[PDB]
Design an enzyme around this catalytic site. Structure first.
Site, short mmCIF file in Angstrom:
data_model
loop_
_atom_site.label_atom_id
_atom_site.label_comp_id
_atom_site.label_asym_id
_atom_site.label_seq_id
_atom_site.Cartn_x
_atom_site.Cartn_y
_atom_site.Cartn_z
N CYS A 121 43.16 14.78 71.74
CA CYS A 121 43.76 15.67 71.10
C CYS A 121 45.55 15.69 70.84
O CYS A 121 46.28 15.89 70.16
CB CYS A 121 43.78 17.48 71.28
N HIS A 180 50.85 22.27 71.31
CA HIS A 180 49.90 21.82 71.58
C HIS A 180 49.18 23.76 71.42
O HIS A 180 47.95 23.84 70.30
CB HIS A 180 49.33 21.66 72.09
N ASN A 213 41.67 24.10 66.21
CA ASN A 213 42.04 22.16 66.48
C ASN A 213 40.78 21.72 66.35
O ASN A 213 39.62 21.37 66.78
CB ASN A 213 41.43 22.69 68.44
#
Length: 436
Positions: free
Chosen positions: A168, A311, A349
């Protein structure tokens, strides 16, 4: 080292333009898609697992024209959507970088640095071309041209090309390499990309039953609540985006309007100290990366760091560790509130693409002078221990002063870290570019 962001294009849940994304964020909307429950899933669930009928879908192929890229309609149907959609955002971002720019200053050589998920389309039942064997159909992974090189070929780009994966953090990993390559003189502009489109498409995702396996980071409730006491994981999503960046010296020499300026970038890996295991981020490792980026941005940037786009993926333990890493970094740098937020409760996400979503939101916030809030902050996560610290999660819009800086973090499975410090273009003596 300073960098100008001069072109953008994006495809995220709820948003195929910067203006659409801004409205999702400012209107505090949830752009995740809910699906009807399936009568038959097509597979059996493990006894302690559930299926959640939510997913951050995008609709990027509605805007993709195969014939604009010398591709037949039949050819296009067997090509990874990630490749088709990344080609479109790269082309649109480069076209965007040609508007509000003095003519006749070619970006060439243009490097291409794209963080990309694995091609899961190729093997999936969603691929209509998923038979006597030949070289062409027996090695389809070999002949799967990497996404970045495919874009360099179709868009006639001739700088360095890299397709990379740091889970990610991939999109900010790509930014870091592009900035290093610009500073090294390898190219005169860089396409910085992130893309993740997952197949087969199932109308939802599998995760643990509530209160089961905490290593199953997908939300059992189907709702991502970053920094919130309700945090129970993230909601997975597809996404694709590209930025065009230049050295700020060349934006000044070439007559480019500028969306926002990158003042500092750093990346690192956690290694294995202070780290619970492969899938648990290290607050120490993160803090080193944040500190490095702030040191590269410099003391005035550090003193004016007002907001971090974390994040912020909404696992309660991961959010707490990420807040701890910020506390550690800023404590070390000291030896006045800093507001904190995330976009993963709006758009899910988007995995390899997720750092680009955060960079775009931060750039828009600096450009427009206001940070969009979390969409639905109720009570903060008590494990983050925000009380009697300078940090607090952002539940209403935050007006910015022209000198305020914004930080951006992305984290990747196995311990990859990235942090970026950005500032308004109007501080740097260049004309600001409008997103809309």
């Amino acid at each position: 080292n300073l960098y100008a962001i001069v072109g953008i294009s994006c495809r995220f849940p709820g948003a195929n333009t910067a203006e659409q994304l801004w409205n999702v964020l400012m209107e505090q909307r949830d752009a995740i898609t809910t699906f009807c429950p399936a009568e038959n899933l097509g597979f059996a669930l493990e006894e302690n697992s559930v299926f959640v009928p939510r997913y951050g879908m995008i609709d990027a192929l509605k805007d993709f024209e195969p014939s604009a890229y010398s591709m037949s309609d039949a050819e296009a149907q067997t090509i990874d959507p990630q490749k088709r959609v990344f080609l479109d955002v790269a082309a649109d971002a480069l076209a965007d970088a040609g508007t509000s720019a003095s003519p006749g200053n070619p970006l060439d050589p243009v490097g291409v640095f794209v963080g990309a998920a694995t091609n899961t389309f190729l093997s999936s039942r969603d691929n209509p071309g998923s038979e006597p064997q030949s070289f062409a159909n027996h090695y389809q992974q070999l002949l799967d041209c990497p996404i970045g090189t495919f874009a360099s070929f179709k868009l006639n780009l001739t700088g360095p090309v890299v397709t990379l994966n740091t889970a990610c953090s991939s999109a900010l990993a790509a930014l870091h390499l592009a900035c290093a390559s610009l500073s090294h003189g390898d190219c005169n502009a860089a396409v910085v990309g992130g893309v993740s489109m997952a197949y087969p498409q199932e109308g939802g995702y599998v995760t643990a039953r509530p209160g089961g396996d905490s290593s199953a980071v997908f939300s059992p409730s189907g709702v991502c609540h970053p920094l919130d006491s309700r945090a129970d994981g993230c909601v997975p999503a597809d996404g694709a985006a590209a930025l065009v960046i230049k050295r700020l010296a060349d934006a000044r020499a070439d007559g480019c309007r500028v969306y926002a300026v990158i003042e500092g970038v750093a990346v690192s890996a956690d290694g294995s100290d202070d780290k619970a295991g492969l899938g648990v981020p290290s607050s120490s490792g993160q803090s080193r990366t944040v500190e490095a980026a702030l040191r590269r941005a410099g003391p005035q940037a550090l003193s004016r760091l007002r907001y971090v786009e974390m994040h912020g993926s909404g696992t309660p333990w991961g959010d707490a560790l990420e807040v701890q890493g910020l506390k550690m970094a800023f404590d070390r740098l000291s030896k006045d509130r800093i507001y904190l937020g995330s976009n993963k409760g709006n758009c899910g996400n988007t995995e390899a693409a997720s750092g680009l979503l955060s960079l775009i939101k931060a750039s828009m916030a600096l450009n427009l002078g206001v940070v969009p809030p979390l969409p639905n902050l109720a009570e903060p996560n008590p494990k983050c221990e925000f009380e009697e610290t300078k940090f607090e999660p952002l539940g209403k819009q935050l007006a910015l002063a022209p000198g305020d800086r914004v930080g951006v973090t992305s984290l990747g499975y196995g311990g990859s870290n990235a942090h970026v410090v950005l500032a308004s273009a109007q501080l740097f003596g260049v004309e600001q570019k409008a997103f809309f």
